[PDB]
Amino acid sequence: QRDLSVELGVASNFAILAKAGISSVPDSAILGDIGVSPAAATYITGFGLTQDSTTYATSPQVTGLIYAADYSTPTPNYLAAAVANAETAYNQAAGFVDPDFLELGAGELRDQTLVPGLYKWTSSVSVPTDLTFEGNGDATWVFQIAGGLSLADGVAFTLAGGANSTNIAFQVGDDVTVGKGAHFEGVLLAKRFVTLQTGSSLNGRVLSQTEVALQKATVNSPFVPAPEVVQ
Template identity: 55%
Template sequence: MKIKNLLSACAIAMVVLFTSCSNDDNTQSNPPVAPTVTLTSPLNSDTNVARNKVITVNFSTAMDASSINTTTFTLKQAGTTVLGTVSYAGTTASFTPSTVLAANTIYTASITTGAKNSAGTAISSNKQWYFTTTTNTAVGLSAVGLGTAGNYVILAKTAINNVPTSAITGDLGLSPAATSFITGFSLTDFTGYATSAQVTGKVYAADMVSPTSTNLTTAVQNMITAYNDAAGRPSPDYVELGTGNIGGRTLTPGLYKWTSTVTIPTDVTISGTADDVWIFQISGDLTMSAATNVTLQGGAKASNIFWQVAGEATFGTTSHFEGVILSMTGITFQTGASFNGRALAQTAVILDGNTVVQPQ
């Protein structure tokens, strides 16, 4: 009986020991899963890639944004690093070249193991791929045709209101609203137009004698056509760049699209040649902070830069802006803001001691 009991006790002890070991194994933490690159754009070996292409990488999980930078995400051509900016949102990293890429040229993009997920786990190995740009020496984006709307530095439908004293170079037009909705200019009436000491040009409104009224009707129609053209351009090169905050960026030629408000809290540079074109499609507002500048570089021309704004366009005190504004909701220049371009609004343009110059 003692032997039988001893054997039973040993059996129980073995079961307990086995179960304890088994439980210990099960409670060990699983090793961390390394994030992976699930998609690149362009794809590896892609050809005929647009020269203003933003290179993007999608990860399998959310990454630590601080680990996605110009050290871990690079673009090279024949071993030479291409300058650009890196941004990260959601699970997507983007590399925006500072200048247009060369035509018919092979580029190599890389993500290193310095890229880590939010838990600090790095990708398992470096990711590298290459692509070849288009043989077309031009970026290929055509300018927005303004028609006779391009005859005006400011064109609006409901009002042009000014707090003196502004200095405007170019003609002003208002239609279908009448001359009484142009305020703050101390107008002097002539046949078919008016003048102001604040305007180097002429001022026109819908209630002035023909052909002024007819010309303005056509110009407003052309303005709306231009707005629709800019808004309808397909296949944007840049989508949701900076999640709407473009402060501090250098913007190369191409078609940009945002589905929300765009802000310019710090200086922006628009870089390209005199033949390059920029179109910015903005579904929300465009808001520029005070004392902030948009500057042109490399021969870029304000007449080839088009800001299509579905919401309000507002430019802060003493800021400086460049380009053609096509606004559906209204344009406001706050005290002392300056502008080189055309302000074309389907509602009102509001001025407050501004310097406005039509582009060359």
């Protein structure tokens, strides 16, 4: 019943967006664009970046484009808006009041099934086992985590009942780590570091205010609609 949609603005153009840097131990696999701002291109590492034709770059690990804050106009302002929009989104997700679940499992989410609503914690959160999201194509979930977030090696987020991960948002105050072969679902609004350990995969987006590290990770963000030109 409650609308806990989070608005992402330009950030919904990005598989990954980071303020300070993005790194990869290859081969990672990214479906969607990636960007850093205010960081310049030197802080996107492990991608073997080739430039054009000079407002973006390409990389074999990115199906899509790579944007850095020191690229040619209008990328800088394109990125600044994505970043500010990402900050706006973080703060909205954190802004929600009157949670439905408070301190659930003392921070440990074990063989859980999460119904739609607001989940808050004052601690870190560990997911030792598979976690299920159940509700309809329109149900929204928001998670407010004041500490860090981890998923144990091999755990999967799975969707049930028609749940859509464009409607799942994680606001996290401290470092996030997705263990090896683990699977993540939703939009990751991280104030600090994010690490996607080897062979981990993520259906959603990663928006970090510091740094994003991928270790042979797979990131699949939703497609962007082609803005339709009037010739």
